[PDB]
């Protein structure tokens, strides 16, 4: 019985690969070979946000693209006003080890999590005037590596226990558990329509998940190592992943295959953070070799470099309006680029 | 600038002061990463993620044990890694050696020293005195090995030599393993950790000052 099931699975995988190849007549490089090139882009450090005394791990922009949040190993979740570089809030954390943070779309809540296997959600808008903990989501049996807010009472968390979870902040229980990964889920990226999301795992696999149905729909492979960062395309019909194999990959939900590979023979270091511009023409690949790179999403060529970090770059985000880019790092300094 | 955008700066300065105070408080505590394996005795070395704090000689040490390819990079800045090993058995000893080799050659742990803790040496002594289980069966080089009961000392020295030989491979001197022997009823482990941490910090300062 087991042999028959294994043979059936192998045949299904072979047929899926054959179908994918049958849908691959041209290449994105050939399609955009006649497009106007981006050229030379030189973004400069407009702001430097000092104040962290440990390595920064996560950073999430606000919807208004003025506030932002960052988490550091010193037990500090700092909410900054990026315009004037004023620390709006500084939240002590129960666990000093935090690997993820999120900012609610309404701006009323923030989220954090890490090696404590607890997703702490803090309510910013309170009568008491201080940032208290609104909820402590528990149930994961591994460290949380990424979390994203859907609404004020719905958050998707990815943990190291090979499972993602759509929660219910009002009741604090997992409304849906997304299973199917064989390794730690490093990152998750919600889609603009908020009906689907993606999750990259250590098995070099990016799985698309339907929030409403609560079941995986598509699986993308093609990476040689762990997938550290993943980000949805602004259109919602594509996404990009960064992996430890020093390559970035572009996948299409409809095409269900790898379109473009952004990599260079010179670079040998893994990607830790990936984010998209508002128009999608620029892919911001954050590396751990102390600098970030800008890739032409349609030419698969490097557009510019963002250097100025003395340590590993951990988190990278783009403002919702596309005004600026925040890049955190392990040297406790997160910079803003424009 | 107006009052609204200046009281904000005053609040930012207050937050900066609090952050500096907290960081100065945190810099005075040494963070230890407690590693090991199941049934290795890591539970009783010193009398989600689990954290413990103990003070000796007015110095506070924090030991964190999690229960490792990915999250280990979160402990890139720990002062030392307390690697506990149960030497009583021999079948799993090679597994412990492989774990130690993986930890030593980790990309994010190339500048951290390891306070190796060969735990449950009393059971090793009992096993080698009984003679029912022979190390030579598991390690063929043990028969050709001799010390630099005397058999217990030879076995202990062999285990330490194997661990140190694993450590010295491509070490480059940036970090050095510090072997130790600890029994179940031992109570001097805190002092050993204290001395090892003192040596680690002294070596780090000497490296910083461009000396040896």
């Amino acid at each position, epitope marked *: 019985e087991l042999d028959q099931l294994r043979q059936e699975a192998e045949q299904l995988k072979n047929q899926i690969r054959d179908a994918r190849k049958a849908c691959a007549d041209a290449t994105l490089s050939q399609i955009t070979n006649n497009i106007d090139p981006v050229g030379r882009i030189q973004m400069r450090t407009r702001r430097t946000l000092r104040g962290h005394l440990a390595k920064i791990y996560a950073m999430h922009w606000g919807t208004d693209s003025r506030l932002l949040v960052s988490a550091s190993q010193d037990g500090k979740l700092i909410i900054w006003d990026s315009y004037t570089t004023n620390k709006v809030h500084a939240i002590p954390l129960r666990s000093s080890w935090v690997m993820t943070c999120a900012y609610a779309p309404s701006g009323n809540y923030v989220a954090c999590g890490g090696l404590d296997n607890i997703c702490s959600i803090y309510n910013l808008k309170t009568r008491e*005037g*201080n940032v208290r903990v609104s909820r402590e989501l528990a149930g994961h049996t591994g460290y949380l590596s990424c979390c994203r807010f859907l609404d004020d009472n719905q958050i998707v968390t990815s943990s190291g226990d090979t499972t993602c979870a759509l929660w219910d902040i009002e009741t604090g229980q997992q409304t849906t558990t997304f299973t199917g990964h064989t390794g730690d889920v490093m990152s998750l990226s919600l889609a603009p329509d908020t009906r689907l999301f993606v999750s990259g795992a250590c098995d070099a696999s990016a799985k698309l998940w339907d929030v409403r149905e609560g079941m995986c729909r598509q699986t993308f492979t093609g990476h040689e190592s762990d997938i550290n960062a993943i980000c949805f395309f602004p259109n919602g019909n594509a996404f990009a992943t960064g992996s430890d194999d020093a390559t970035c990959r572009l996948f299409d939900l409809r095409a269900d295959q790898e379109l473009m590979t952004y990599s260079h023979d010179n670079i040998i270091c893994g990607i830790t953070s990936v984010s998209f511009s508002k128009s999608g023409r620029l892919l911001l690949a954050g590396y751990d070799d102390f600098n970030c790179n800008v890739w032409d999403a349609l030419k698969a060529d490097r557009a510019g470099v963002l250097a100025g970090h003395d340590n590993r770059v951990s988190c990278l985000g783009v403002t919702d309006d596309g005004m600026a880019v925040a890049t955190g790092s392990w040297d406790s300094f997160l910079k803003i680029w424009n | 600038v107006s009052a609204e955008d200046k009281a904000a700066a005053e609040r930012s300065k207050m937050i900066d002061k609090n952050l500096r105070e907290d960081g100065e408080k945190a810099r005075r505590t040494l963070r230890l990463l407690l590693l090991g394996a199941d049934n290795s005795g890591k539970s009783t070395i010193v009398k989600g993620i689990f954290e413990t704090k103990f003070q000796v000689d007015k110095v506070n040490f924090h030991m964190f044990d999690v229960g490792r390819r990915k999250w280990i990079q979160c402990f890139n800045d720990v002062t030392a890694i307390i690697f506990v090993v149960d030497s009583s058995d021999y079948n799993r000893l090679q597994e412990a050696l492989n774990d130690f080799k993986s930890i030593w050659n980790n990309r994010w742990l190339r500048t951290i020293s390891v306070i190796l803790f060969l735990n449950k040496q009393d059971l090793l002594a009992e096993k080698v005195l009984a003679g029912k289980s022979k190390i030579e069966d598991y390690f063929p080089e043990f028969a050709r090995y001799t010390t630099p009961d005397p058999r217990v000392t030879r076995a202990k020295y062999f285990i330490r030599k194997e661990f140190v030989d694993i450590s010295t491979a491509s070490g480059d001197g940036r970090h050095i393993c510090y072997p130790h022997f600890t029994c179940a009823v031992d109570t001097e482990n805190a002092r050993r950790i204290f001395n090892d941490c003192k040596d680690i910090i002294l070596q780090m300062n000497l490296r910083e000052y461009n000396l040896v």
Partner: single-chain antibody, 232 residues
Framework: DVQLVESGGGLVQPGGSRKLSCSASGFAFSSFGMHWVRQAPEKGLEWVAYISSGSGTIYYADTVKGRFTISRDDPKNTLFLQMTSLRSEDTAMYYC??????????????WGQGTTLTVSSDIVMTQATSSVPVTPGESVSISCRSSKSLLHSNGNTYLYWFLQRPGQSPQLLIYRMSNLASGVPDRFSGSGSGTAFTLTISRLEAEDVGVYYCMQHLEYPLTFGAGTKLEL
């Protein structure tokens, strides 16, 4: 939850001394800027003093500068106003007002109780209307004018609207001329440009009758307008 109580007041002979206390409970008093704002028995509200978080910045009104001292005890969660040489024009009802300042904050959100005290250039805000008789359910408007433009170079127009019901302490309605304070019904709205602002309410309900004050916060002092009045 949030509650500020006041102690002191009473009768003071002219030129005397008095210590007014404001005890906070239910919120982080250390991180909230505090103000003392006085209201005359038959006039508008007058700003008296302001102290920042941690006592790092203190401002006084020109009327009471040099004669009034403001202080705060964070461990005891107390706000102190020491008044010396009380003139006959300093008799008023004093309110200690919380106000926190960060991007998106709502200053003057919660006003404490009142303490009566009976003694035996500046941007001036104009409230042309003195009393507007209105009927419930009818949308009305209140007009306010400023001597100088309140629109700042950052796009933030520091105008605040406060409501005082008969026998009740003031509360914040609209802060920064466009945003609505929390807990206030969505009927209220604010609009206008520099030196010309309008607070428009739709479907006026019961208990909405009272005094309305337009305050500027561009710089100091904090000059309240004369304030209009809505009555049945």
């Amino acid at each position: 939850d949030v509650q500020l109580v006041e102690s002191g007041g009473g009768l003071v002979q002219p030129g005397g001394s008095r210590k007014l206390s404001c005890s906070a409970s239910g919120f982080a008093f250390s991180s909230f800027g505090m103000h003392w704002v006085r209201q005359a028995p038959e006039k508008g509200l007058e700003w008296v003093a302001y102290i920042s978080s941690g006592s790092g910045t203190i401002y006084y009104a020109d009327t009471v500068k040099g004669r009034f001292t403001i202080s705060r005890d964070d461990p005891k969660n107390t706000l102190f106003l020491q008044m010396t040489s009380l003139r006959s024009e300093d008799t008023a009802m004093y309110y200690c007002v919380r106000s926190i300042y960060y991007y998106g904050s709502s200053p003057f959100d919660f006003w404490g109780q009142g303490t009566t005290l009976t003694v035996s250039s500046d941007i001036v805000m104009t409230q042309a209307t003195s009393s507007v008789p209105v009927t419930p359910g009818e949308s009305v408007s209140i007009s306010c004018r400023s001597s100088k433009s309140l629109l700042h170079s950052n796009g933030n127009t520091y105008l605040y609207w406060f409501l005082q019901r008969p026998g009740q302490s003031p509360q914040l309605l609209i802060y920064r001329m466009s945003n609505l304070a929390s807990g206030v019904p969505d009927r209220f709205s604010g609009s206008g440009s520099g030196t010309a602002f309008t607070l428009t309410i739709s479907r006026l309900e019961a208990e909405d009758v009272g005094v309305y004050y337009c305050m500027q916060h561009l710089e100091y002092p904090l000059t309240f307008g004369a304030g209009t009045k809505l009555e049945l």
